[model samples]
Target: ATFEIVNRCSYTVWAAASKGDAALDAGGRQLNSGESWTINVEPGTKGGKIWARTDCYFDDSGSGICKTGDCGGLLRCKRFGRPPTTLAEFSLNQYGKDYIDISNIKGFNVPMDFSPTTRGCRGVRCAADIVGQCPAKLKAPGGGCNDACTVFQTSEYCCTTGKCGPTEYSRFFKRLCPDAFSYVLDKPTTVTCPGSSNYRVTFCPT
Candidate 1:
């Protein structure tokens, strides 16, 4: 499947994908507003996640810092980035099915729209202005809403134990976007698509 990633934000966004597949754009790319990157993704990709880094300034060598979601401090993202960014997570061609979702399990930075371009599969979006309205304690430095776990790191928010449920912070995010996973154990957000489907992930989508 080919993943078409789009950026609609007014600023530049460095998009990063997990799995470190060079065919998948070498794990990351810088997309200016109105720009896009179409990545060829092969089968057997598990636990794949795509997110956008914001307020970044990379030198000619692709080394710099991003206010949110910085991966290895490199523009190409040698690994998965730090949290406080919205995620478009995927598992393509797994058991003949494709699982996808837009989640805030790491937290919320820029809004996202993760959708299938074919197969009529359900798309998920998290376009709320959570950062602007972020709770006082959960707010990050530049722009983002840090998940309760990142701030507190307790079992209640992280679900490090056997069972857990939603809390005020999780519910706060859920109230903004019900389709986006607010916490680690927030099920029912994953959408299944066919193996042959292509996907589109848009940053700051309207």
Candidate 2:
């Protein structure tokens, strides 16, 4: 399978992907506005995520800072991006299907769409204008909305201990992206494609 990443936003975006504990394709690369890149993945690649970083500055050594979605201050990320990042998560070839979702559970820095390139599978997206409308208490310093877990760190918001559902904060995100995961226990935000299906992930689809 392959991941076709497209940057449709007005600004440059640094795209990053990872499988397991290793960075894929040397971790990431910069894609200028309207640019696109494709990265091949193993047939059974599982537990992988793709995300974008914005307003980044890096040196020749691939070290710098990003206003959003910074991953350990490195060009190649072995770890997941920080909070307030839009994420496209996947588990390929699991139970003979590819499970995927666009998640705002970590909060959203950018809008995104995830779709199967082949037929017979439905696509999902979260293209809302979240940053400008982010709640005052859940706003990040740089930009983007912070997940309730990040802002409050309470069991109610995090859903760490027992059965939990959406709160006023989670509803804010759900109202925008009903197809995307808004919290840890969000179950309605997933889709399954044939294991052989390829995917197209687009930033700022609108």
Candidate 3:
């Protein structure tokens, strides 16, 4: 299947993706407003995520920093993007289907929409203006809202204990982006599509 990533934000965005043992394809490249990139993924690929980095400055060698979603200061991200990012997560070809979601469990830096390009699959999005309404306590220093787990890091917020559920903080995120994963134990955040379906991931979708 192919993942078509589109940049709809007014500013430049550096999109990133990672999967186990696979060379990163879209990392460190600048996608100006209206630009798009596509990458092919073999079926059965698992434990991968796509995200965007904002307010970044890179050197000629693509070594630099970003205000949000920095991955160990490298262009080809070997690790996950840092907190305060909007994530499009996927476990493709799992149990005969594809599972995907837009997660704010780490918090939201940008609005995003994830949808299947083919028929017979549901679309999910987290396109709310969360940053503008971010709770003062959970606001990140760089930008965007921080998840309860990131800000509080307690058992209740992190769901480190048995069968944890939403708290007031998690409810805050859920209120805006109801389809997103607002906490560690958030349920129904994942939606499944048929295997081999193509997907479109748009940043700042209208």
Candidate 4:
């Protein structure tokens, strides 16, 4: 079956991600927003599938290609066997297991916020975690504490001056939420430096 551009945006672009074989008759080009492009899609076998994708970025040919930057190198191209049938949904950790448990990630984070904690031992427990430490509340509501993030106390033993030792607290949070945006928490003038730190979390858009 072939797909047609019933409607288009003035400056947006679109693409086809189909299974088996698919081709765009419009030539590789960028469609402005609200513009529509059609492509021929070879139907899959019974129980088989196809996915159609659309994006705002341009492809190798400068055409807007969806799912292009989803993975390592060109792998995303081959995965576009069919046009995506559904909108993509992603879950991301906003707080690096600091304000909210890392496992609570549900969807994309927008305008994320990352700030260091002023209370508690570095990487140990922050005022954020109700339980006082990551180890204590490692897993969600129903499991034993897991050493998810190691705690560091006292900079005399710290590898980076007054910062946490071995693994910097920010590093731990970054590792946990690589895709999520984040920042660090610097010591204040009046407060003694417990250690260097930072936490991250996302604000879901309405």
Give the winner by TM-score.
2
Q: List candidate 1 stretches off by more than 4 Å.
A: 20-23
> What stretches of model 2 exceed 4 Å from their correct place?
none
Worst 10 residues of 4 by lDDT: 102-111
* Candidates 2 and 4 compared by lDDT, better number: 2
Model 1 C-alpha RMSD to native = 1.6
lDDT of 2: 0.89
lDDT (0-100) at residue 25 of candidate 2?
64
Q: Please give the lDDT score for candidate 3.
A: 0.85
Top of the candidates by lDDT? 2
Minimum summed lDDT over a 10-residue window in model 2 is located at 18-27
Give, for candidate 3, the lowest lDDT window spanning 10 residues: 20-29
- What C-alpha RMSD separates each model from the true structure? 1.6, 1.1, 1.4, 19.7
lDDT of each: 0.87, 0.89, 0.85, 0.26
lDDT of 2 at 114: 94
lDDT of each residue in 104-161, candidate 2, tens digit only: 9899998999999987789899998999889999999988899999889999899989
After TM-score superposition, the amount by which residue 193's alpha carbon in candidate 1 deviates from its true location, in angstroms, is 0.4
Name model 4 segments beyond 4 Å from true. Answer: 6-11, 20-29, 43-76, 81-206
